[PDB]
Design an enzyme around this catalytic site. Structure first.
Site, mmCIF file in Angstrom:
data_model
loop_
_atom_site.group_PDB
_atom_site.id
_atom_site.type_symbol
_atom_site.label_atom_id
_atom_site.label_comp_id
_atom_site.label_asym_id
_atom_site.label_seq_id
_atom_site.Cartn_x
_atom_site.Cartn_y
_atom_site.Cartn_z
ATOM 1 N N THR B 15 0.823 -1.233 0.000
ATOM 2 C CA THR B 15 0.000 0.000 0.000
ATOM 3 C C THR B 15 0.850 1.273 0.000
ATOM 4 O OG1 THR B 15 -0.254 0.099 2.381
ATOM 5 C CG2 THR B 15 -1.847 -1.250 1.175
ATOM 6 N N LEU B 16 2.159 1.150 0.211
ATOM 7 C CA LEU B 16 3.087 2.271 0.473
ATOM 8 C C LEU B 16 4.441 1.957 -0.138
ATOM 9 C CD1 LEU B 16 2.259 2.614 4.273
ATOM 10 C CD2 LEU B 16 1.909 4.424 2.585
ATOM 11 N N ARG B 38 -2.176 -2.889 6.593
ATOM 12 C CA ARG B 38 -2.922 -2.925 7.874
ATOM 13 C C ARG B 38 -4.119 -1.971 7.853
ATOM 14 N NH1 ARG B 38 -0.461 -0.847 11.706
ATOM 15 N NH2 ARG B 38 -1.417 -1.904 13.482
ATOM 16 N N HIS B 39 -4.118 -0.937 7.036
ATOM 17 C CA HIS B 39 -5.120 0.153 7.111
ATOM 18 C C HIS B 39 -5.921 0.225 5.812
ATOM 19 C CE1 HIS B 39 -3.161 1.552 10.799
ATOM 20 N NE2 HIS B 39 -2.070 1.981 10.152
ATOM 21 N N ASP B 62 -2.371 -8.465 8.285
ATOM 22 C CA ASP B 62 -1.104 -8.429 9.033
ATOM 23 C C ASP B 62 -0.390 -9.703 8.629
ATOM 24 O OD1 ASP B 62 0.886 -8.809 11.050
ATOM 25 O OD2 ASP B 62 -0.444 -8.054 12.632
ATOM 26 N N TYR B 155 16.381 -7.296 13.239
ATOM 27 C CA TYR B 155 16.197 -7.170 11.773
ATOM 28 C C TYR B 155 17.213 -8.050 11.016
ATOM 29 C CZ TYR B 155 14.791 -4.645 7.498
ATOM 30 O OH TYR B 155 14.300 -4.295 6.268
ATOM 31 N N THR B 192 11.924 6.189 0.938
ATOM 32 C CA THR B 192 10.488 5.929 1.216
ATOM 33 C C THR B 192 9.967 7.125 2.013
ATOM 34 O OG1 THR B 192 11.074 4.704 3.199
ATOM 35 C CG2 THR B 192 11.065 3.474 1.145
HETATM 36 MG MG LIG Z 1 -1.754 0.131 4.957
HETATM 37 MG MG LIG Z 2 -5.172 -6.176 10.014
#
Ligand SMILES: [Mg+2]
Ligand SMILES: [Mg+2]
Ligand SMILES: [Mg+2]
Ligand SMILES: [Mg+2]
Ligand SMILES: [Mg+2]
Ligand SMILES: [Mg+2]
Ligand SMILES: [Mg+2]
Ligand SMILES: [Mg+2]
Ligand SMILES: [Mg+2]
Ligand SMILES: [Mg+2]
Ligand SMILES: [Mg+2]
Ligand SMILES: [Mg+2]
Ligand SMILES: [Mg+2]
Ligand SMILES: [Mg+2]
Lengths: 251, 251, 251, 251
Positions: B15-16, B38-39, B62, B155, B192
């Site tokens: 999404t990003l 997530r959004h 997620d 990470y 980013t």
């Molecule tokens: Mg999102």
């Molecule tokens: Mg979710």
């Protein structure tokens, strides 16, 4: 000898096989050693087979047990004084492809092989930094940290993680002048009584398409590279992979 | 173009930033795409900014959510037909040394970066094998899968794990003639809007001692290597690391 | 397509096999190409099989010939304008162990595989730097640049040299803002009419213990990764190895 | 100690710096040593500074000299009996980018660093195979065999070549049961009186962006890893890289 004069080492999974050979050579080179394992009967016999309690003792521990890590460092300190050396050797294997790995198998293996190495490395840094010990964290990271095996999906994940997590720790310790080195050891196939419990495994492991030397190694092959990495002989080595594999990864 | 004719792709974290650039170039090359994030507000706007619902849709997920993985493959099938292509791009970072990593931070990061990539890879193999799709699993595995960073302990662990777990999957799929390839992509530092939210980060990332080109990359730099790996152009590539890093790992 | 709009490429050993497939896809993507080879009869037919002289021409050259490199860049400039792209593909093999390699075999192979790649890389940097061409040097560096083969001693030496020499060049070009990228391509076993001249070679090369996909690749497999590396799509890739090997090095 | 009981070693460039430290520790561990160098005055003093002629002698040799290699093995045999151990340590550096390397500089450096290592490795295999010596060839292959340096073009080529040529030799020796191991040692920056002759070099080499430990190593750091690789302690190690670099390649 006396290559580990004054060193105090913890060796996880030190009651059998590779871990016991590391313990044996560590004691022979003047280290005081605390070995861990899951079974007291095996662990106490293993410690006694190597030396007296002023040289080597056993502590019952599952390397996945975060709170037990604190008790293990406390016990080793009480026996031998400040810990200088940690060998994160304990590990398990699942004989599954990624595709056929259950979530339970995935989490069980990562708890030992990844979380346990993290818990030991993190606590070791905190306990061994800034004490002038020539401290050394030696993490068991496998040929399976360099190459895949289609039947060791979770194991490959864990050993790739240990390989690079160890470099992060090495760098932070170096940049902060902690006097802690972190390195990985990468065994190829080694004759362990466990391998002797898997009929055909050693022959499979000895095929020239797997191990070009045409045979597998012995536990002392891993003990000797660990002595080097624990000793002040390796005081300029940090963040590196030490491979002892009979040529497996060279082809 | 039409380099992804007939392909059906899932892109996690699509999404990003990098994931959205991958989605954009995938649609431009003829793929049908399901992006996750997530959004819903961000995700639906992102899908609409790329194309119509016959080209690209959004699914709220997620990547740490094992059961949601099954619903995501089901939803993508229902929209577009059998999935051919999976980009495991979703990930998080903790800005801690190994020493300073809490157990909660460790488990949170590994849930997304390691467990989520495992869940997607495992399900992808099962759903995409033996269908003649020219299937491709593309796992995001970082420059931090090759070298340590003293402030990215967890990470580094996750990206070392993805690197070698992916080779295991590649081998099993190849040996079993599944018509599924598995490869890793290793971005260096990329501009980013998130990097744009960390004052001084891009300048730090552009120092010649970090990125020899003296600047960081853009999202399309990662989109184009992912198009290659998704397309049948890369039908002989499996088990390999594809690095796009401005020279970071070359020194 | 038009992925190589305005590019001017030299491809050494471009008259046959992998080099000819690279030439073909380069012309299809809008590049102007000068192919080299040792035999004019083969080279002129190869150029004509791809396109017209306004798209592709042949220049007779032995890549070991330092002075001929200067004439090759001059000829390409005269035909097509400033060179943007160099593929150092020409190479030879000796089927000898290190132990059984004569000094004459050693020097002959290194003259082509190492000196020739050096001559082309060095001249390419000087000719392509600071011209805003999005210049790209693509050096052929083999799976035999990553792993040994007991019967390819001199070849392994040459391909290990190309691998790391290329990183040096990449770094210098990046740090000096030359607008020249240098990367290596690492084929696994590829079906070339030459392989078709070695009875049993393809079957040997296709054994799962060698190539896990159970077959060898085709020339277009190497052409497509070279298109990516020549194009501005790869403007953030430099100093890196791009492996297309059917899983050979993943195990 | 006595870790090299009965071993007979040749160490090229053994009269100064790293090679002399390797010679010193080899003699301390019970090896008989023949050191080489270009200047008899330096070489004879170096041998005498380590031990008596029954422990260590000097042979004047340029490692680029193919015929002299035969005389060096003959001389060592005559002094000490069959050679078990070869350290290919002699090397030179040119402080030039690939772009700025003359053909004369290229050929001079490769004659020592690549041809000389080839001549020694090839002859060592022939002389040390099938004699039950636990034979070990230890080739000096640098951090510059793993990463580029923009000002060490020819050096990077030579050290990448040594890295992978050594794996070829290791494999052939393993597969043929020659009882010869071949491994590479990869020093980071080491304080040599030569480094002490380059004002500012050690400080440049000690910057955290170069050597994370914040200082460079000493000659004994390389001596101790060479003792391990020469000894039967490392009988399962072949085809591998042993890095002692203060963290240089870990970031
Ligand atoms: Mg999102
Ligand atoms: Mg979710
Ligand atoms: Mg036990
Ligand atoms: Mg217990
Ligand atoms: Mg292999
Ligand atoms: Mg976990
Ligand atoms: Mg690599
Ligand atoms: Mg680096
Ligand atoms: Mg020709
Ligand atoms: Mg000619
Ligand atoms: Mg001398
Ligand atoms: Mg001389
Ligand atoms: Mg030469
Ligand atoms: Mg390595």
């Amino acid at each position: 000898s006396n290559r580990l004069d004054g060193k105090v080492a913890i060796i996880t999974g030190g009651t059998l096989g590779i871990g016991l050979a590391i313990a044996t050579k560590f004691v022979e080179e003047g280290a005081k050693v605390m070995i861990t394992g899951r079974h007291s009967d095996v662990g106490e016999k293993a410690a006694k087979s190597v030396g007296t309690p002023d040289q080597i003792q056993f502590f019952q521990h599952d390397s996945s047990d975060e709170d037990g890590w604190t008790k293990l460092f406390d016990a080793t300190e009480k026996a031998f004084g400040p810990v200088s050396t940690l060998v994160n050797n304990a590990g398990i294997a699942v004989n599954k492809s990624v595709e056929e790995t259950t979530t339970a198998e995935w989490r069980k293996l990562l708890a030992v092989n990844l979380d346990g190495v993290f818990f030991g490395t993190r606590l070791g840094i905190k306990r061994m930094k800034n004490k002038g010990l020539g401290a050394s964290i030696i993490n068991m990271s496998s040929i399976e940290g360099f190459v895949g095996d289609p039947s060791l999906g979770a194991y490959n994940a864990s050993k790739g993680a240990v390989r690079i997590m160890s470099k992060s720790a090495a760098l932070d310790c170096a940049l902060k002048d902690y006097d802690v080195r972190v390195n990985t050891v990468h065994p190829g196939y080694i004759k362990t009584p466990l391998v002797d419990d898997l009929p055909g495994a050693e022959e499979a492991m000895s095929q020239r398409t797997k191990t070009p030397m045409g045979h597998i190694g012995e536990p002392n092959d891993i003990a000797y590279i660990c002595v080097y990495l624990a000793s002040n002989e390796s005081k300029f080595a940090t963040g590196s992979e030490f491979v002892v594999d009979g040529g497996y990864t060279a082809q």
